[PDB]
Design a binder for these strands. Structure first.
Ligand SMILES: NC(=O)c1ncn([C@@H]2O[C@H](COP(=O)(O)OP(=O)(O)OP(=O)(O)O)[C@@H](O)[C@H]2O)n1
Ligand SMILES: [Mg+2]
Length: 476
RNA sequence: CAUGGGCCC
RNA sequence: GGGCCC
């Protein structure tokens, strides 16, 4: 998105952390090319000659405007994927009850309790237990006063820039490539779930290549659904965007909002409203009130759905803008916002799309960048989706998500203070799929020190998840 | 003891 | 309440 150009303000929004993340006993064994991000332009490690606050805003290279015939081409594609979308999800997209928006239907996790509240509830000391009864699902004064307000469209706000205390490859750290999180006022996040909460539920619970979304899925059982499907095709590309989130041009955004969330598909007129408030934003990083047109607010409600709908309409628009007769069945695709796998028989050309894609402000590039350009052949066992490769499992003939040891090792070098035992239980079931030998190497560090799930119990868990009746087949 | 949105104990 | 992927 284009910055008008940031201002001064007298109020000053603290963030600049020091990492809650810390080395582990694994840390010294694995010596990973991975550290906590920078949470301070003062932080030593950091290359010298680096103002951390520069880069955070170097993802705003402008805001591609779109010809009038591209806006029509894009409109069609969005109404088309929208036709598909509501064909599979139905048209029951009535507003959600403040009770659900807080509580959550069957497929919409509740809103989280102890979570930051956005503005200005932190310019005025208050957490989200002070305007909502999380586990009674209950508004209070201003939430309900603003509920009333956005109902009128006479509501307006600002986004609280943050920094992702997270691990990152060492180099990205030194570039000061910290990931931003733009936190929305919690009232907003709530109205949004009312406006489009039943949509997102249905999305979550019909994920699959049919709707091109993997949001809602379980990389751990769903990998089988997905692997067999994608191995039915002669060509499978692993595409990488870049700044995906921030380069959603203003026109692309306003069109999909208009095309996906109309009232003719069951929504309430104000679902376009809450959504379009997301185009031109005000990001308050500290005393800098940075004002931006374009992009998405990474972490603005439904952020992953939106970005997924958008990726889907982009591909189809890039194919539609290069050849004729391209329908949704021309290909197949699954994304999770940024991430995307695509497949096709038609021997399609993806280095011929880069430009058509650059007409929306987006820069695709191959995943295997140590070639040069998009090639044919690649099956679904050369790609990555969500940081997991597709491998088939010896013992079962089933597909399974596998992360590079170097990643797994990264995750296992750093924990928040006294989380190490819990984290490990969690990472145990990721590392299952790396086999018995590596699972073991990967955990030597913590022996006689922490509890380590047996490789065997994690396997039979998995086997029962992927298709329980094969659990029951390792029997008769 | 970051936002979203998912899912895992 | 924790971990991950996005
Ligand atoms: N926590 C959040 O609010 C959140 N997390 C993931 N997302 C959606 O998923 C995308 C992940 O962006 P990345 O960190 O991969 O970077 P990028 O902007 O896509 O590209 P690159 O790393 O190539 O510069 C984002 O761009 C965003 O659309 N939002
Ligand atoms: Mg990828």
């Amino acid at each position: 998105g284009l910055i008008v150009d940031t201002r001064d303000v007298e109020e000053r929004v603290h963030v600049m952390r020091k990492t809650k993340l810390a080395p582990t006993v694994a840390h010294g064994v694995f010596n990973p090319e991975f550290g906590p991000a920078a949470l301070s332009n003062k932080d030593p490690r950091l290359n010298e000659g680096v103002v951390l606050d520069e880069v955070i805003f170097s993802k705003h290279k402008g805001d591609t405007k779109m010809s009038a015939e591209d806006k029509a081409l894009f409109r069609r594609c969005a109404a088309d994927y929208a036709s598909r979308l509501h064909s599979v999800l139905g048209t029951a997209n009535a507003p959600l009850s403040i009770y659900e928006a807080i509580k959550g239907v069957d497929g919409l996790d509740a809103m989280e309790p102890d979570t930051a509240p956005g503005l200005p509830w932190a310019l005025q000391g208050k957490r989200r237990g002070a305007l909502i009864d999380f586990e009674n699902g209950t508004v209070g004064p201003e939430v309900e006063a603003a509920l009333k307000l956005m109902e009128k469209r006479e509501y307006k706000f600002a986004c609280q820039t943050f920094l992702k205390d997270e691990i990152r490859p060492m180099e990205k750290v030194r570039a000061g490539k910290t990931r931003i999180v733009d936190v929305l006022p919690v009232e907003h996040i709530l109205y949004t779930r009312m406006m489009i909460g039943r949509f997102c539920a249905q999305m979550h619970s019909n994920n699959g290549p049919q709707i091109g979304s993997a949001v809602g899925c379980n990389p751990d059982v769903d990998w089988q659904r997905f692997g067999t499907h994608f191995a039915q095709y002669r060509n499978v590309w692993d595409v990488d965007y870049s700044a995906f989130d921030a380069n959603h041009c203003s026109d692309a955004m306003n069109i999909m909002f208009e095309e996906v969330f109309r009232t003719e598909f069951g929504f309430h007129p104000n679902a376009e409203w809450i959504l379009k408030t997301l185009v031109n934003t005000e990001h308050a990083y500290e005393n800098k009130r940075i004002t931006v047109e374009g992009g998405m607010p990474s972490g603005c409600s439904a952020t992953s759905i939106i970005n997924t709908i958008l990726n889907n309409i982009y591909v189809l628009y890039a194919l539609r803008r290069h050849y004729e007769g391209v329908e949704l069945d021309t290909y197949t695709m699954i994304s999770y916002g940024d991430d995307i796998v695509v497949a096709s028989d038609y021997d399609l050309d993806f280095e011929a799309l880069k430009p058509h894609f650059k007409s929306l402000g987006q820069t695709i590039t191959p995943a295997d960048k140590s070639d040069k350009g998009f090639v044919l052949g690649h099956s679904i066992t050369d790609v990555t989706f969500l940081k997991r490769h597709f491998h088939m499992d010896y013992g079962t003939g089933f597909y399974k998500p596998v992360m590079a040891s170097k990643t797994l090792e990264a995750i296992l070098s750093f924990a928040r203070r006294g989380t190490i035992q819990e984290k490990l239980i969690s990472v145990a079931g990721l590392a299952v799929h790396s086999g018995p030998d590596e699972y073991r190497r990967l955990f030597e560090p913590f022996q006689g020190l922490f509890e380590i799930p047996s490789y065997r119990s994690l396997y039979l868990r998995w086997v029962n998840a992927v298709c329980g009746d094969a659990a029951a087949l390792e029997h008769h």
